[PDB]
């Protein structure tokens, strides 16, 4: 986030998700998984809207719907059941918070409130 801010100032351009994605994966790969960060990286930039997942070992993937953490299987079950192409904003928030709820209820690792 710090290095992306300095890059944005240097280039006089709003930062891109692919930049954050590249910088994260090269850092996590360097440390061979010893930095146990499992991140879902999303955002909008001049290129458009982007959604990526990045694992601790430094592997990245692209998707329309992603889930990570202990509740990923509870969340993915809901996403695999209810996701469709050309979702509206209201539908996507509903589907997202429904997938977290699945995790909260059915996973001992997940609990409390939903942040969107």
């Amino acid at each position: 986030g710090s290095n992306i801010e300095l890059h944005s100032l240097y280039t006089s351009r709003e930062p891109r998700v692919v930049s954050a994605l590249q910088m994260l994966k090269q850092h996590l790969f360097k440390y061979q998984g010893h930095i146990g960060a499992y991140l879902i990286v999303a955002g909008v930039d001049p290129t458009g809207s982007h959604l990526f997942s990045i694992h601790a070992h430094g592997s990245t993937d692209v998707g329309y719907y992603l889930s990570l953490g202990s509740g990923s299987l509870a969340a993915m079950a809901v996403l695999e059941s209810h996701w469709k192409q050309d979702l509206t904003k209201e539908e996507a928030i509903k589907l997202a918070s429904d997938a977290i709820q699945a995790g909260i209820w059915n996973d001992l690792g997940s609990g409390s409130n939903v942040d969107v």
Binding site: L68, G69, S70, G71, G109, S110
Partner: peptide, 4 residues
């Protein structure tokens, strides 16, 4: 350490 703490660990979703």
């Amino acid at each position: 350490x703490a660990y979703x």
